[PDB]
Design a protein around this nucleic acid. Sequence first.
DNA 1: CTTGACAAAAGTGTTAAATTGTGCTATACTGGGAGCCGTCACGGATGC
DNA 2: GCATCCGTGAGTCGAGGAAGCACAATTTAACACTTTTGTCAAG
Lengths: 194, 336, 1358
Amino acid sequence: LSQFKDETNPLSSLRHKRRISALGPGGLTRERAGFDVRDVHRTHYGRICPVETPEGANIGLITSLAAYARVDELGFIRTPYRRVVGGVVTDEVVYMTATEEDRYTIAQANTPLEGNRIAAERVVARRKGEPVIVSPEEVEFMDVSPKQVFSVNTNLIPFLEHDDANRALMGSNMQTQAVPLIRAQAPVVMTGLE
Amino acid sequence: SDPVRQYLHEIGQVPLLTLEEEVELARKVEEGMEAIKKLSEITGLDPDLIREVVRAKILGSARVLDPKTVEEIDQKLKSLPKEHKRYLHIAREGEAARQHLIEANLRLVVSIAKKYTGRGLSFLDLIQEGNQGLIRAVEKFEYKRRFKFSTYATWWIRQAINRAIADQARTIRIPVHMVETINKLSRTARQLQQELGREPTYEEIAEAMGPGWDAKRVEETLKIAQEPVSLETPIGDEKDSFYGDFIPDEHLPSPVDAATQSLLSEELEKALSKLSEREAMVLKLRKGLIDGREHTLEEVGAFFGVTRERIRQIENKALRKLKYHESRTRKLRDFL
Amino acid sequence: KEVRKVRIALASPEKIRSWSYGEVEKPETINYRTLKPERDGLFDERIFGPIKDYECACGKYKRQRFEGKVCERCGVEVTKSIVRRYRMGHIELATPAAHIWFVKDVPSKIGTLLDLSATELEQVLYFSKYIVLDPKGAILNGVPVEKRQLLTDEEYRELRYGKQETYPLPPGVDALVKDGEEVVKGQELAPGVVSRLDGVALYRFPRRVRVEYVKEPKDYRVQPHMNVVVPEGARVEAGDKIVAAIDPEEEVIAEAEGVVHLHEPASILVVKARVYPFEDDVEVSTGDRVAPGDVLADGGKVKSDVYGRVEVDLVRNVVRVVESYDIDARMGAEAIQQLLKELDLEALEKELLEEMKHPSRARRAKARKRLEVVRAFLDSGNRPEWMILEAVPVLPPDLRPMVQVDGGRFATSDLNDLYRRLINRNNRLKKLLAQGAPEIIIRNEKRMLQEAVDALLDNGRRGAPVTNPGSDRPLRSLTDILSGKQGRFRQNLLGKRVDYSGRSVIVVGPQLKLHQCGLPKRMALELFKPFLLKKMEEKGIAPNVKAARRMLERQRDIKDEVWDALEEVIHGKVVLLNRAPTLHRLGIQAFQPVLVEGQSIQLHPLVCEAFNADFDGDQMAVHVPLSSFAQAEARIQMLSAHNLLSPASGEPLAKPSRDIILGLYYITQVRKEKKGAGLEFATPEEALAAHERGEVALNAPIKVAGRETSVGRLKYVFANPDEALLAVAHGIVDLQDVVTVRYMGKRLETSPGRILFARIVAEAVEDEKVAWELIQLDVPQEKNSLKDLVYQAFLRLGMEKTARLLDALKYYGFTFSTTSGITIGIDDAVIPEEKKQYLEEADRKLLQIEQAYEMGFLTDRERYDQILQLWTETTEKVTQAVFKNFEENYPFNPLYVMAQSGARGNPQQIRQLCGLRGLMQKPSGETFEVPVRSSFREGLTVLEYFISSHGARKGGADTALRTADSGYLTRKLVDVTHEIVVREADCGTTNYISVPLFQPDEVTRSLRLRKRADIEAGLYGRVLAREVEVLGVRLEEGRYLSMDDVHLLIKAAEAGEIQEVPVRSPLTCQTRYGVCQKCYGYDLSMARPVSIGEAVGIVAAQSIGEPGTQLTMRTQGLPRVIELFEARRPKAKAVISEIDGVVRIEETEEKLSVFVESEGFSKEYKLPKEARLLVKDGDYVEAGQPLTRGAIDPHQLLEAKGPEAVERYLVEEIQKVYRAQGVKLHDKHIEIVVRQMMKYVEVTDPGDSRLLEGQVLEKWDVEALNERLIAEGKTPVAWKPLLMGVTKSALSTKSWLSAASFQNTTHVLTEAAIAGKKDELIGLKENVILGRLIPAGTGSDFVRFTQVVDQKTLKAIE
DNA sequence: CTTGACAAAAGTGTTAAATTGTGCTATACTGGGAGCCGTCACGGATGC
DNA sequence: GCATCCGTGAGTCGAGGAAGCACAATTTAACACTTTTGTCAAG
Ligand SMILES: [Mg+2]
Ligand SMILES: [Mg+2]
Ligand SMILES: [Zn+2]
Ligand SMILES: [Zn+2]
């Protein structure tokens, strides 16, 4: 786990510090790990990036922390959710773990709002990771933003919703390998995390 | 499957000795040794030879001097009268007592040896080296002094274990005096390191060691104390690269080195053709191009029947001609 | 002479000593200060040779004149220092040590010969139990002791030294028993303690002596340092000593005459012994062993009455014989070695043969296994006791070096530590033995010595692995050196690193010819350096080679004439390009280098598919063949322009690809208009008149009078292709406009683009008539049409013209795709108007299902299935709507054109871009009820993106874990078929196989014709075994079937004239160690009969395993192939009828039974309740015919139907997996592998032979043995066909070198060594290991000895 | 073809330091310590 | 016949490199004196 720092560019070093490895002393073995440890569990939503992982023999074994996620004192990843009471979305943000998240109906960040009141009659939500359609009054929490599902590298890909996941994996990984240029210039289309 | 558990179980089958049992066994060994000395003096035999025969009989036929001479000496000892056969009986009882006294103190060596682990030798190696010291302790132990056996045996067991570590813990053996120097040097560095709050330099170590020690000697001693590194140590998380894959072989000549040696030999042979039949022979003998080894003016002189003085003149003349030919062609300067 | 065979055998202690140049007696390696090797150590110069050439240690001899001389001062031989790699030493073990290979390799060879279990062998070997070698009349618990009986430590001690026990009395109390009184078991000795055995009870340490003077019970106290010197009840005269002491002041004497009485014993010793009082001198002493009738004392008056150890007690002046036996029992390898020396192999074989007649099968199986080991030892000439080591060989020090690195640090191998431990323990054991140490110390040291030998030979096999102190890394032992993927075989013998090799990044070279590559100048300078130095010397660039080499060392010293010389050096030569992984033989191809400026290798576009190379950063290796043979082989056989067809299928492999297809498809596709589209006229002048008025388009389909034409076909009529293309140049018409052109005397109605394509083919082949016959003019040129063109050109013209045609197609495809205007925009992903309607229909049906589910008409499982079917149907409808929209409105859409032409994409990917993403699967395997209703053009939502990520990860992990299985499958196939080579023109066999043309479909229950690809993969390039008369055409026997013949046979089958075709196959070939030319067929890579000497076994393995990655993994896909090639029994196996007859179902509520009824027989099959029966009542089933759906067990089928049926089943079931994935593979390659699977037989009746019942041998050997037995009139050997997997078939091969280098190296070598096996170097792996010329290709004896000579020399010789 | 004269240069004999090897310690001590841990498949092996 | 255990196997390139002490026995570094080339004139 004590690794030579990857500092091709500032994003390379930022990514290396947010990487989560299932290997190392006391962990799995590269050839002794089955499909189960390498899959995207439903509780990875908001805590581990679903796309960013090394393609090859280490796929699913090395992962990245999602942008809004934070590790608590006991070591369990938490992700933020906006409290929704009475159909109005409040500014109270609650950081909560996967086991605590399973007890609530959590709406989606793209739910239309008329101010703070949920405007849509049909709300796309999750109940223990399953997508469902609910009414505004059945909603208890809301996603902070679409960015909390992905890592820092993946949040730097504009028009990500139009890309296949297999190619977005390559895009986020290759941003780490980009070399600094004497005439480097910021992208014309950005996402906001630059 | 566990050798340590198997050994501990085996030594647990011999009960520990009480004080009365310890004194009786120790007394019998001393009395037996004196009986052997008397038997050798009376019979005129070598005391070492008689002791081996007495030991061989006690240990029995289960142990691999051939057995025929053991029986012959045994019969000769038994042919002695009763007053002399008594010393043979005392010798036999003493040897049996020594075997039991060693067998009943195998727990002591294990207790001592468990404190020396991690210093280059495995636990069972420490035990067996400690057993060798225990055997020596039994030989030299004196029960007249009224000291317990564990008091005198602890000195020999620790000595045997410590010497074995000094002799067998390094692939490149370092003598005991030099090992003690390394151990003392390490202790002094450790004491200064915890007192200065940092790693001492060679000057602080040398000053604390005492007279006759300077920073150069400390560096040389530390250089000597460097263990070799294994050729099979992996590098990287992948287990497919080792140290041996990055160390070139610099003993055998390369294809380039072999080729230029043959090219030089071919060019030198062509250059020596211009020389006379005898002038070429002299230079190839004096430079070791024929027998491989350089000859001298006299040795070549005996070969041709000429004296020493003439040969150096013709060799100088022939060498001058080679310089002239090489100057006019410059076909031999690149190989230099 | 020449090495032809390699033999492996056991080494005796005598042979090991004969190898050694000296015994290694010290564990010292080198001096710590002078760094010179130490005398008698592991690096001794007196043993292994001088460090530097012709120089002794003392430096007295330093030249070659004293060659073969040994310096008297130091003892070092004056010779070459390289002998240090070859000269071995040895260690003389103090005690024998067993070889771990012949102990722990199950089943043990030592245990088999000695009839000891694995547990019993370990207990004896590692000093846990004794084994009896001479009982000496010993009795154990009332039962006599017998030989080979295992004794524990307690039992051995009781037999050898007797029974005794010490009972500690409490202080102060007095014993109730006297000294020397016999006691019995359970008798009380003191008031508080009771004895547990019967024997003499003796006072150990009397604490008080009570003497009775005569005048007086005076008492004396005894202390631990005082000892009593007199017996109990002894009359002591005044002055005689009573108690001895260290200090004479406290010594106790007797005042007057009296009797000494002993009291207060410290403990009581009860020993089972016999006490013999005596008066004179004794004839024995302490420690001797006596028998009944032996004299003891008094000159025969006292004699022993029982066996035991005798001890003399001078205090009690009696002789005690402790009852014991002089039993012979030993532990360790010294006991095992003695047993192995006493075996009579001839007598053991006779007893085993007699027991081979026992009725029990288990007894016969056990006797056969023992006899096989006995036969191996008898035939080889080895001795069983040689399996125990008395001398350990020591490896030459240069193979276990202690080298000084540049930094001054020393690096050493792990073998030195293993050798040092063995020497340290061996030397210590010698010292302990010389000191007469107790048995416990000696036993522990012997046990450690055995473990040190085990660790050196094979570390970690038994017990905890040995690690270097200060780390937890196990030491590398001799076994680890030779075994594994990183062992000697796979890392240094089967593959090596090579000189004259380079590597760089590859970029595409479109300007190259098919046989050319772009090699960087700087790589070429280094690769061809020795050739360049010679050329520089030849010209005036440098005076000699060494001066030339100095010039190239510095970059700024390289002049401009070096590059001209390098151009001259490489003229004509070729290099090998290689891209890893090398899945098939097209992964290495030879190219003629073209020196280019830059640092990247330029690769031809047409060879990318064979290399599986793209240009996103791949790298390739460059190799330079050196000699004329290596250049000739590469230029003739390995050249890229010569390998145009696939060896796996015979189809083109260098063919037009992505951009080339797109450019050629664009020009050969015609335009379709809609403006006019249907108007009818009366005269063509009216039709054109409407065109200038704008009423009808140029390519609108109209009817002039009665015929359907277009305005373009009427308006533009060209006299020749030149005029048509001149009009295109002026912009009069486009390439896609359909006009009328007069070509080859025919008034054609095509587009100028299609007429241009005809000229492209015509000029490339330089034949207008043949090129006209090769092309399909009236269609756009897609991937498949272009592939047919290349194949037909290869058949009619050859490699040279086809390579020219391929370059011409590449040039024009690249040119036209550039200027055509293919681009991808966001609006190119056209959303059909039907998608919105379909989704509304899906919502209403879904809402309808939910209402029904609320009403209770259906359960959860059927509701879930109905939802999935709805979305699967809707997904299919959208896919049709997506593509219908393209083919109607946007026929030139980039996504549609790429998919239609075969350039890129498939309908599934196009649907995701333009239709809907579809249904997705959970990580558990279930599909989400809600699909992804949005495409990539519209953009997925955050939740839909996360849902889709589960499948993306699962496929990514599936691919990663599939490469390992596919690559390991290929290695199995190579190792089982590496020795198969085409070795003769014809084997003369008359057997064959009948390839079916009709498949028994079950859904219709009738015979239906197979697919053309299936028949082509089974008949193309095969020799007819019998003459066939179909459709008036006589295909004679021995005729190679081309594609025309296959198509004729398919046509005849469609006419009901033929059902199957008899062909010669590798399955029925009778050639030993390979196949013949007439049984293989074509070299599919050349569409001509296979040349003798081809390694078809390697080609078969590479062909099967190359598409292994494309097989789905998720009893299906690659796992199905692996179990089929391994002949594994499926978990859900089907039920097959053992005998033929009528089926009788007895289905009942309790259980289900199937009865196969015949005239007299009735077999009962008890099927499970959930059995999907495929046979109903009133059916005549045959032997081996399935009764239940599932996979047939190959071994059950083999015993029920026969070898032919299982071979047909295996080939068909493997081909099913590849067909389902779209992979085209000939049946020859699978039949070659299956032929190796069915290579062995099992003996059932030995007959008049030495073979054993149940012995497994090769089918060729038993057949040769059978015909020999018949020749001299003897009973033949009855055998039974046997099927085994590729792994077992490869490991049971006759060559130990190939088997050892594959797997199970320890097991393969331990059996080969005992049998003394001799390897004849027949296949390919054995020759590669020894560096010999492989017996295939140009190294085959058929062509190897060919001589070439010109006419003038021939007459001079004649 | 040498013949004496000299001048280093390698060889030999003492000679002492310097290094290396070995024996010896006497109150009484008497059975070790880190292992701890996410695959799955086959073939085989006595055992029962 | 049947769990249970033991053993063996699981793609290729590349790039990463913790006593001291005394005393004896043995080896080694320095000189000092010969014996032997090497190199001169003399011929
Ligand atoms: Mg690539
Ligand atoms: Mg016209
Ligand atoms: Zn020498
Ligand atoms: Zn044949």
